[PDB]
Design a protein around this ligand. Sequence first.
Ligand SMILES: O=S(=O)(Nc1cc(-c2cccs2)nn1-c1ccc(F)cc1)c1cc(C(F)(F)F)cc(C(F)(F)F)c1
Ligand SMILES: O=S(=O)(Nc1cc(-c2cccs2)nn1-c1ccc(F)cc1)c1cc(C(F)(F)F)cc(C(F)(F)F)c1
Lengths: 271, 271
Amino acid sequence: ESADLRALAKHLYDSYIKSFPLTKAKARAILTGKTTDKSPFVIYDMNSLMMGEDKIKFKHITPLQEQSKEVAIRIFQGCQFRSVEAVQEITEYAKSIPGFVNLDLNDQVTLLKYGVHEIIYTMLASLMNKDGVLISEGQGFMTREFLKSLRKPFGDFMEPKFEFAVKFNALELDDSDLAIFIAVIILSGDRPGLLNVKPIEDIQDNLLQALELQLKLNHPESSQLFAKLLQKMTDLRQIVTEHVQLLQVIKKTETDMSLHPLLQEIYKDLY
Amino acid sequence: ESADLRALAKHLYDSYIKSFPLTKAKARAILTGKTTDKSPFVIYDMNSLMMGEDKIKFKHITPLQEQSKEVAIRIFQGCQFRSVEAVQEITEYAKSIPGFVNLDLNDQVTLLKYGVHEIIYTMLASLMNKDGVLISEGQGFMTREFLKSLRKPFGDFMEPKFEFAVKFNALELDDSDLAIFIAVIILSGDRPGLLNVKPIEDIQDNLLQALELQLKLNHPESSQLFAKLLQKMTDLRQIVTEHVQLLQVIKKTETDMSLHPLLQEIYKDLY
Ligand SMILES: O=S(=O)(Nc1cc(-c2cccs2)nn1-c1ccc(F)cc1)c1cc(C(F)(F)F)cc(C(F)(F)F)c1
Ligand SMILES: O=S(=O)(Nc1cc(-c2cccs2)nn1-c1ccc(F)cc1)c1cc(C(F)(F)F)cc(C(F)(F)F)c1
């Protein structure tokens, strides 16, 4: 039944709603200017950032990290903290994908480890326009120009993500489309070191049918959107390998210590 | 609500299975016989010690270096390496505790820094009986009468752990009980130097309620088990102060030591 596929789409939207407080629909209204209530703080330069360490921290001192050290470094570390948070959220959502928790425990672990980054860049696009990105739970907005202005290695971090987002966003996907897409990415039977490939493909098969039916009904006038969407999955992998290269350059060339243990042993045979 | 609290237990039990390779179940299987494999190498004197270390012949080099010392200090070296490795495991599991990674970064660090040792000994009981302890992934045993025999300082190290374990093990906790208990340990709002106490206590509260239900549902005949388990937190805090106490006496009677930088930080300014 098509009814079951819609039931599955529906189940995935609701779990997505619970796992991810800042949804695309909310982020876009923020990025535009709907129901004017509490406009976000704008970080457009080194000075406004300084002025802003005490606009997302000073209220009560519970930050992503302390002061001092280069601004490029501080932003880097703040994004470390932020990604481990994104990961817990993605992990929670994953357990709500039917069949996922019943997979071999270590295949769960492998799936998450290779899948999380592609889900971050997909979902970070919902938070982006062509001019910058919502941060601090939609409380701030950091310009693409400022990120790009940071000294050499760190100024190149974000541009590729911005470039992906602009084009991905032109697809006009809504959270109900993204909910199933994110689930398709998780369940990829081609990740390195997976034990049982077939049960993962059997799940991704059902989520592919659901994704297809979703897009046909929700986006009838977008000829071959399903296909276009699956092709973006190769774009995502590129953004990831490229982000992984740059992290390897940073860690080999820089002089700043003590980092987030999460993706530290996860630096072992990645993308 | 009961179902939230049941899901919390279930969640915590999964990450537990994911972060910790030698669980309590599997370990008692090795101590009992219930397992369909091997039989651990018993170390009781200097000769069977000089047997157990060299026994590494079909079980080659473990994550650690070459045993470039003597007897006591030779174990002193390996257990340091085991500790480092348990910490990694405990850090990984902590990140999976809902709300942990959203806390102030410095309080995450402080919570780990104190909580780690308590969880070490708690989980060390799982691998213990009154006669000795599984070491090396449970491929070895190592009598309490051997460990007790050692030199003036090294002679009071595992004893307090064994005595703790004997009584803790009479509580009949499983892996699913222990999953919640260890989370309640890390989320302790009284650790010195904590910056925002209340959000930590908030989470412990929820964990405490989940512990309660787990015990009540899992051990319905065990009178006041909740209270008796939590009383065990005082015992654990004593083992830690004793441990860290020999670790000082060691700096007066022995020569050069030096620790993995992860253990140096973890023992830094520790009561
Ligand atoms: O995947 S990211 O590009 N990671 C990242 C960016 C940056 C920097 C940008 C500018 C100067 S340093 N650092 N990191 C990062 C992330 C994780 C690490 F382990 C190490 C570094 C990322 C960027 C951002 C943001 F766009 F807001 F910059 C946000 C996140 C979030 F919220 F998902 F955590 C992630
Ligand atoms: O926490 S322990 O008591 N550590 C420890 C024991 C011992 C020794 C006992 C007898 C001679 S040396 N040394 N250490 C130790 C551990 C870490 C340090 F930084 C310094 C010392 C410990 C003992 C054991 C065991 F019983 F196996 F000995 C195992 C572990 C494990 F698995 F948690 F790492 C930890």
